[PDB]
Structure formats: C-alpha cells, structure tokens
Amino acid sequence: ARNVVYPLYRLGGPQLRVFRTNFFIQLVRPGVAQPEDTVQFRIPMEMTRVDLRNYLEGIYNVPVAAVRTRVQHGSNKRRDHRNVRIKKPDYKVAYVQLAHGQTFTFPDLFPLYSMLEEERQQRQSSDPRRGGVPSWFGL
Amino acid sequence: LPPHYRYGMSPPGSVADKRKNPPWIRRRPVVVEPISDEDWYLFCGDTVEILEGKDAGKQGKVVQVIRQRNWVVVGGLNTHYRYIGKTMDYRGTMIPSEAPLLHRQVKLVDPMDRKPTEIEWRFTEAGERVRVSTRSGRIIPKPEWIDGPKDTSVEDALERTYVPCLKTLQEEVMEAMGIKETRKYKKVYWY
Amino acid sequence: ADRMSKWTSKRGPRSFRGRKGRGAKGIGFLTSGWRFVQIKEMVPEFVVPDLTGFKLKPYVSYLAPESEETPLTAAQLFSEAVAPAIEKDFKDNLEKYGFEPTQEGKLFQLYPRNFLR
Amino acid sequence: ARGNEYQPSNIKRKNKHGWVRRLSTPAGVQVILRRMLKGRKSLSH
Amino acid sequence: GLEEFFDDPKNWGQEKVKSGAAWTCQQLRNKSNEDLHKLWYVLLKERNMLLTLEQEAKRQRLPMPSPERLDKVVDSMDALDKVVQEREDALRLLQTGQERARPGAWRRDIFGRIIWHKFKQWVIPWHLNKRYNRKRFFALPYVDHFLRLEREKRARIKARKENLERKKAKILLKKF
Amino acid sequence: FTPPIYQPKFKTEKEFLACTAGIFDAYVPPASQVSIRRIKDYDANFKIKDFPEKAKDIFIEAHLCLNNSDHDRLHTLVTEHCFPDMTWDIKYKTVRWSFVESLEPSHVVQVRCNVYGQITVRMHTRQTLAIYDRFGRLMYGQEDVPKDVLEYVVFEKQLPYGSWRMHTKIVPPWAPPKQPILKTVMIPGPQLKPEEEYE
Amino acid sequence: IGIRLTLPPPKVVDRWNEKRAMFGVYDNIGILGNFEKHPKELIRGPIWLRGWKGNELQRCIRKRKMVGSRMFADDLHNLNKRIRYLYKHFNRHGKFR
RNA sequence: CCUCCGCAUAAGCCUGCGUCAGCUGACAAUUAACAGCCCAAUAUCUACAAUCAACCAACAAGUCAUUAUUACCCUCACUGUCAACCCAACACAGGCAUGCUCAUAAGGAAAGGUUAAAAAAAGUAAAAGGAACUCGGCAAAUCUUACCCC
RNA sequence: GCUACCUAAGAACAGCUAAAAGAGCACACCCGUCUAUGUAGCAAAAUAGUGGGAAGAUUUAUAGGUAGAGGCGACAAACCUA
C-alpha cells in the first residue's frame, strides 16, 4: 500500500497485513532484447521487490524466481511556453524472472466519410485540354 | 482550463480546440450576461424559433448547448458553408456548418401552437419544476443493453449482502479467510 | 546550482545517494558489517481472497436502477447494528452489545489506527 | 584565471545554504520568512 | 497467470470494447465487507490490465481501445475505497468518538503558522526522542512582524479580488 | 576595473448534411410511381406536371446568379455537392452566361429516393457563354452567337425546409464535344530523371 | 505611429442618470435647515480628509495621525518616508525663503 | 596524418548526437555481486612506527590490536548505475583529484574552394663580416670565461 | 565551493646522479623569469617558446573553522566569490 502510514512493528508483534492493495502495476514490452523468462513491469515508486514478488504470487499466482528493480529518471529538459521545465515523472522498472522454466513473451496487441470518399472519387479532375476553362457549362 | 479560456464551437479538449486556444493565448474575454442555472430555459432537443439573422422565423431543433457562452446550436439552421477535406489538389466538399445563436436571439416553441413563447419556471405540485408558457399557458416538456463478460447482472449488483456489524473490514476478512493471529500489537508512542 | 528540481537520491555524492531513498517503506535493519536483516513481519502480507465463484465484476450493467447516495453515518450504523439488540434487551455493561471501552487489546485498533488501509 | 569561483559540491551546498542551517539560527529563520513573504518558489538552497 | 495483465485475446485489436458502468457508492454500500474485499482485487486486476493496455498503446503510437473503461475502473475503486472509509469512520466514531484515524495536534511551527501536525509512531517517548526535540514547535517574537506582513498581503489580495469582481459586475450591468 | 554587464537572456533567446454523394441510380439516356408516392407522402403538396417550369426557373436564376457571383443565392439554388462545381473553376474570372428561348418544353425523366428526393429533368435549351480572364480577355465562347445545349439536370431535396436545388448534371458519353478552347495548350511529356530513359 | 487608425468606440454619457440629476442636492442643507447639519458633513470619502484641505505634507501628516495605527506595515513605512521627504523638501528646498 | 591524449573511479551535471516522425514531439533505457546505506550494552585492554623490515640509519616520533560478562534464530531490503557530461555567460586554445595505458588495441582531423599582392604572425636557409644592432646580446644561434653590488 | 591561514583524515612525486640532503640534472605536477602573439582575445589575464622548484617550508582531492569598526596575512595595505 502507498500513501498510508505503516503500523510501526515492535519485536514479537503481529504480521503486517495489507488487505486492499493500493499498488497498481503495468506490464510493459521491453525496449531491448530480454531473456524468455524475464517480464518487465512499471511499478509504483514505493513498492519493493519483495512486495512485487508477493503481489504477483498472491494476486496472479505467478511463480516468481527473481526480481530486480531500477528507478528510471524522467526527463526534466522539456520547457513550456513560459520556459518552465516540464518534468516527465520518474518511474520504477522491475524485471521479474519466472520460475519452473516458465517462459513469457509480450503478446502482439493491436494485430459523412462515405460522402467525402465518393466525392473524392467523383472529383473529375480538369483535363489539360480545357486549359483552366470551367468544364461545368454544357456549351 | 486556462483562465479566461474562450469557449468555442469545438469541445474544450479536442485537437481543434487545442489548435485554436493554445496555452499561451490571452484574448479578450467575451462578455456574457449571467444567466443563472435556475433560469436557463433552453435544452438540447428543444424546438426553437430564430428571431434574428438569416433564417429568422424558421424553427429548428437545438443540437448543442454551449452554456458557458449562452449558446444554442440549431441543427441545419443559421448555416454558413465550409470546405471539408480540402487538400493541396482537391478543392474539398461544401458542407453546411451551423453558427451559435444567443438565447436572447432564440425563443422556445409551443408544443402545439408552433409559435414563439415566453417561458417561466413555475413550480407545479406534481412537476415540482417545469417550464410554463406565459402568453398561452401550457407546459413545454423537457426533451431527452446487453451485459458484457465483465458486467455484473442487475440482480447480483443489487443483492444486499451487507450485514451491518461493528467489525472493521480487516477483521471481518480475517474471520472469513480463517487467518489466525495471536501476537498482540505492542503499544507505540504517537507524536 | 539547480534549486528548483526536486531533491532525489540521484544527485548527491556516494553517501547522499546511498542514504536517501524513494519512499519505499523499510523492511528490516542493518547489523554490523552492513548486513541487512529482513524482518518477516515488517513485510506487508497481501491478504488476497479466493476469487473463485465470485459473481461481481469490474463493471455494472447500465440496466441497474439509479439510487440516491446516502453516506453511512455513525447514527445510521448504530441504528442498523446496535439498536435492535438494545431494544430487545431493554424491553425484557455495554460490552454485550458490542461497545469496547478501550481499543487496547485489539489486533485492529481503531484509534490510533494500527492497520494498513 | 578568474570566473570559475564555483566548484560545485552538494555537501557544501546543503551544509552552507540548507534548510537545516537556515533554521539553525534566528537570522536564517528570518531569511526563510522573507523568502516566503516574497513568494519565492525555492525557500532554501 | 500473466495473461490476466492483458484483455481477452478476442478483444485484441478491437477499435471499441463494450463495457458496463462504474460501480456507484450507493450500490457498493449494500455489499458485505468480504464482497468489497474481493471486488477490490477484481477491480485491481482490471485496472492493471487497462493500464497495461494504455502503456502498450502509447508504445505502439495507437489510440487506446475504449479508454473510458480505465476511468470507470478508477471511479469504481475510488467508490469502494470511500465506502470502506465511511464504514471505518462510523465504527471509529462509535467506539472512540475520534473523527480522525491518525492522531494529530494543532501546533505553531517555527514560522508562527498554525498547522495540524500529524503524529508519528515512535518506540521511545518524545522527551527522549532527540530529533523530535530538535524540531521546534514554537515561534519566537521576531516572527510576529512577518506574520502581520503575510496577513496584510492576504488582505491586499482579497481586496483586489473583491474590487475586480464588483467592477466586472458593474460593467456587466452597464452592458445589459 | 569595471566588470562587464550581461543583458537578460530572454532578449536573445526569443523565438518565433443536406446532400448526397452523387446519383443514387444514374440515368442512361439513349416505373417511378413508387418514388413519386414516397415524395408525396412526405411533402403533402407537389405536382409533377408543374415541376419542370419551376426547375427551369431555378436553373436559369442560378446561372444568372453565377453571372454576378451571387454565391448567397447560389447556395439556396444549388446543392452543396454542386456548389463547388458551380463556383470553383470560375473564380477570378467574369462569366457572361445568358439565356434565350428554349427549343422544346422541359419535362421530367425519372425520380428516385435521412431521406433525399431526386428528380431528373431533360432540357434542350439555347444559351450563350463568354468567359473572360482576370484581365477581361475572352477565353471561351462568343458572347453573341448562341448554342444549343442538351442537359440532364438532377435536382435533390431535403426531406423539412429544403427545396429543389440543382444536384448534378449527367453528361452522357455520346454527348457532342464541347466548344473548343481559344488558347493553345501544351501537355508536357514525362519529366525524366537522368537515370530514366524515354519509352 | 502614435496615432490610432480607427475612431474609438462612441462614448455615450447619460446626462440625466440619477447621480447627475440629483447632484448638488442638500449642498444648502445648513442654511436651509436651521444649520443642523454642516454641508461638509455631506462629504463622503477618506476619514482623514472629510471636510478638510491641505497640501500633500499636511495630508500625509493627517493620514498618519488619524489612521496611522490602522495602516498596513509597508503602507505606514511608505507614509513615514513620504512625510520625512516632504518635510525636507518644503523646509529646505524652493525658490523663495 | 595527429595523438596533448585515451579508458575507468571520484566529484559535478541530470537524459543533454539511443529509435521513430516533423532542433521539436513520442517512445525506449541505467537490472548488483561494484558502491553507499552498519554495529547491543557495561567496564576493561592496549610502550616497542613506516621505510621489501631483515642488517643499517635515525628523527620530524609517526595510518591500523582486545578482552570479561550480560543480551541476541528474520537473513540479501533500499538507493547510484545513461550521455558526446562538470566550473568558466558559449561545441570557450582555460581549470579539473585518483588508478592503468608510458604511446597506445583507445581517441582524433591542422586544409570550405581558389590565387599565391602588400602589411602582419610563426618557421626554415643564407654569400662576407660576427654585437659593428641595441638602454641592455631583447630575440635567435651556440653550449661559453672571469669579476663586482645586494 | 575563489582566495589567506588553520583542523581531521587521505593521495602524488618517472628516470639518472649522489647517498639519508628544506642535495644536483630532469618527467608528471606546481609556479609564472623573459620574449612574441593576443588586447571585445581561445581567455574579463590566455597561447607558443623559454624558464624556477620538482622528497619538500612541496603539490594536491575531501569535509570542517576563522566574517567585515572583523577575519587571515613568510606585511605585498596581500586575500576574503572577477
């Protein structure tokens, strides 16, 4: 969970449990060639790799073998009309290596006008012989 | 939206609207009389009569209502003509485009008299709020699915499974799922 | 020299970059030799229910009737949960009806709240 | 020979013009108060 | 499985995906805590799938198929969270009379401003907490001048706004 | 010594429907009572025996409007599908179109039919043209000598306040070639690139 | 080029709006009302110059005296500076003596 | 043809020559073992440099250690990881710590094209003479004595 | 964050000669004697050559300290963000 105060744990205390998870993640096509067992996710910044492992293992029942994380810096170079820097949000990227020899590949997602088209068909482009003379007149 | 944004015919978030009103424009604000929400009497679908300009007297149907500028668009009325699809070579095609009309320039029409009428927001015991024509009486009426795989059935959505109890969702779910926790939360200091 | 850009862990020298985090909640502590000891109880445990047989869906059919919003209140909850028992026992020590004098002793204390979400 | 008097180092930057140091003394608190009154986006360096 | 991060294969490439309506707060209020708990994860999985769709659409430079369902899912999750928060608030008020889940106090910071300082969890008492003791929750007399200056700045802003509004109203009356 | 003064940087980092698409059923020049009823039931007042006179009047008045570039009236006199054909190629050039007595009475040919009317009228009239340039120099047709024109004019109507306006002129493949142009023209051959060779 | 190329929008002045029509009424309230009210009491404006006139220095002194305590901090600082400067100007500068 | 360099770390900056389509917008990317981020107390310990540490040599006397009890089963979290880069208003002949490469396996291009006027800068060569120049052997070339003032 | 000085804990000093050197020749490095160029310049003090030191009172990275009727100063009235 994010944007919530974690109940402070003291030795011998109860297990910390989150019932309504606040984290929402994205599965993103890698920008570079990746091993067949690796899945790339975009994650909330406050989520740990342990949290991601538990999240995937519980909500999705995905057997996770390893998790690595890196914070990708968002560009702060673009400037608006007022010359004020526009910050692309920094995000977190997690690489999850599946277990039990399981393999994953990003699926191949994404595999009046009639009058306009018919008038374009009926354009009747002016012939060179007409020499710019309007051809509408029947004479 | 940016302050003093000039509402136009295009919706306030379309490509055309962004093109016409980029963030840096500072055009003079348009003066519009302050018609209260409880005094607005033109609605989408109302049959209206044009009082001024070309096609004055003709009665049409309101197609759009840009309330922020006291505008009503009468379908196929108050029309100029513009070219759509005009490319470098093709001249394009002529299309009739409606222009906005002010509520002062437009008046509602009696449902049966088919004549312009002045209107009042008179309360009625049955129709708590409804329009009433003044010059000839009568109330002008206000004009106006298959479940998918991820859509709940109506009966399921309306099933009242809630049992008012003094248990938090956390402990209720713990009881439901059988999670057993014996450790007692040690006290902490708040400040 | 950049005063406006947000201060993150990517900016300072090695010590600053190591020390500053990204808001991720801690999981354990550090012992001698910089060995990190991870406490299992500090790791949030996702209490995921069994969704098998669940009839609800992320969306609701538009055919559902419209209703008036009535935000739940303490008075409404008391009427719907405690009032029946109170009436039935009065017609014939509030802990019997549900009231607890103190939240201490409960795993889920209502105030100060000691549970996630 | 001159001009490059600024040899950046975040440690010195924060230890010389940081929020903690500005609040460390009453004068720096007034510095921050002046910046807030003026409406500065960056109160401390 | 990871297939739950993507819509049904039949819907891949569809220009439009037919969707229901977002859950309403009143509709959710009739559901049990267990039902809301399960619906939370149902909506979470749907939200993850829709966010994946949005990101892949951006990657492919193609319009997202039916983006409105993402807003519907977000609204449904917000409504469920609001219902749960309402139930928790009612129970907390009944059992303790506290309107706020997190302890806090009205305090005057070092700058003389009145703030609602939210308490934090500590293992040691405050009188022993060194860093907390370093923090200052009082304003010395030199801050009164700046407090007055800020008050006068606020008053000037308010007066300017009110005068502008009245002048605009007069201009409108003249025009009509 | 006096330090140099820098000016502000910004000073130097400034930087700069009521129509149809064509013809529903093309009439091929050398049983429409269903469409006649389909228009009667929606109009409540119409006379096929009298329509040709109104059609001829509208045709002549629209061409006279072309004479003066009265686009305001042309808009109501011709359909939007026809207006660009009426007025596009004639921009920036004066036209002296005139009408002279017809040769045979105009009569309807056939009629067909959210809902749009359609009437085909055959006219064999006599007309005159004199199309000039931007500079007022004749480039098409004698202004005095008239010519015989055979036309198949198709009107369309909107079915609430719409009227009958010229929609399209059907030119049969067997129609005689129009009047020859006055100025000689050239039709360039393929502008070949170096590698290309003429074929 | 410091001249506008179009006539400015016509300025219509209603000489018979209530304010102009009733302007000056009760200016003789004193002499025509048994002197119960002095005409200067009809003056509506700043409290420190109601029925009183003076040069800028006197006006500033009166403003400080009468509403100085209620002035904003920087406005009062500016008024004190203005009073000091006007004193210096009127008491040390000028053609005559 | 040049190689001042170059490759990394540090510091600094913060996406700043990756892809796509029109410098701009979008898309992608830096994955911890390397580094940072440490230590339960209470007392108690510790004279004998380094210098290949061995002769020897010292002086300026020097960078490295535990014990005795009591506590103590959860182990791999978080953050940096890109670049043609930073400080000099600049694609600035300047400044910029360290390890290797001691001239490179790495990195680069002094000439936009033409002509070959004066004047100007840098360089090479010079008949005979060899300081006659000049304030002064400044500069250049050679590899040169002896003496004064401070 | 420059510079004057200092504090903590670091780093650099090829090769040759002499032996233990505030020694000699001479790299890196530091400095800036003289000349020429430049003088709105590559540079708000630089470039090329030449030159002084280059195991020491040396040079230098990091953090900290001394603040203006003050600091610091191998006193040049030097330096303390051109």
Add this chain to the structure above:
RNA sequence: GCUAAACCUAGCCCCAAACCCCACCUUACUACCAAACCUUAGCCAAACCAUUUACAUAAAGUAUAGGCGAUAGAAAUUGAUGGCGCAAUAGAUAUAGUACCGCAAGGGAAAGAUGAAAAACAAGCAUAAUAUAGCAAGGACUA
C-alpha cells in the same frame, strides 16, 4: 510593399465598509532511537562639526526647550452610499516573485490583441545609385 503600424481588456490604484491521503527542522518535503527577553544607529540640518536636528478642530506654532541656534514643542481647556484613478513603456514587479542572474542574502524581467461563429501612417529599406561646388537651404528661375 516589406519591416511594420495601430486596438481593449487582462488586470491594477486610491478609498469606504467589514477585523482575516502521504512527506517535511537529518542533506526539509527523509515511516521507525536514551534553548528567547537586552537604549537603535547613521545619513541629514546647523551651510563644517563636536550638544542638538520633526518621526477631528481650537488653545498654538502659544507656554516652554535649545552650541537660547539650526530647530524642537506641549498641557490646562474644547468636543468629534465610489472614482474630473491607469488602460499593456501606464496601473502592482507581476502573464511572475516565474524565466533569468548571484554560492547566499538578494536582484528581477519581457510580452496579448481577428471574428457572432475558425465545427467559416515612425525610423530603416525597395520600387528608383551616382555628375563639378561645398551646414546642403534661401532668393530665385523656363529649367
């Protein structure tokens, strides 16, 4: 005919009335370890400067103070519905305390103009370089 020119409202000025989720003092915006109160000075005037020098009405610029001089200065007593404002070099610095500049305190900008609907004449030059001689013009002249 190019550069360009213009515009009217964004707002502002003076008054009156009225009193106005989470994170963050550690290297701020980082979940979680054994102490405040203390005379203002100076410029400036005295033609220097040294004592000294201002910070409702009426009494009254009076009594008084004062290198008795520049100047300072009471009290008793008296009773107390808006714009002959600005209109983009103006009016707030303000489109903004932003951009930008400085290590920091701090300094601190510029500018916009169509329409009911966009879902419709400065300078400088060019047209058109130039003719002996001259503060460039004046008297003139057919020129």
